[PDB]
Amino acid sequence: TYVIAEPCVDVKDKACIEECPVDCIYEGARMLYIHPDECVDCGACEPVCPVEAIYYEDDVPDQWSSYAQANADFFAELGSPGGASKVGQTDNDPQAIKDLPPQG
Numbered sequence: 001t002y003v004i005a006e007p008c009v010d011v012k013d014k015a016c017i018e019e020c021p022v023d024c025i026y027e028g029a030r031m032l033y034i035h036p037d038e039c040v041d042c043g044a045c046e047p048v049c050p051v052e053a054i055y056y057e058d059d060v061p062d063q064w065s066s067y068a069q070a071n072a073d074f075f076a077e078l079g080s081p082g083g084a085s086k087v088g089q090t091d092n093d094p095q096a097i098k099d100l101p102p103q104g
């Protein structure tokens, strides 16, 4: 899977959502989140992010290493809807991301 990390927080450019063939990038209040059970490693999202927030799981930097679990935790109550388009923005951000001070 690919992973959205800290640079997305309170930026949310949303260039990435255009590119994903399976529509598995979902919007929270603070950032977007890649569904790890829906992502099939197409990689089309990663080049388009203007703040380089997106990484393949194995390439997520140590300083943001907790963001992979955060992406999974976003879907605790959503399950696997099988497409972000119908869900829209939801207030499902995990505690760890909710607690970050305002950025940008």
Ligand code: F3S
Pocket: 004, 007, 008, 009, 011, 012, 013, 014, 015, 016, 017, 031, 032, 048, 049, 050, 051, 052, 053, 054
């Ligand atoms: S800021 Fe976020 S919303 Fe997508 S284009 Fe970059 S990951």
Ligand code: F3S
Pocket: 001, 002, 019, 020, 021, 022, 023, 024, 025, 034, 038, 039, 040, 041, 042, 043, 044, 045, 046
């Ligand atoms: S384009 Fe979609 S399939 Fe995964 S690698 Fe990016 S979220």
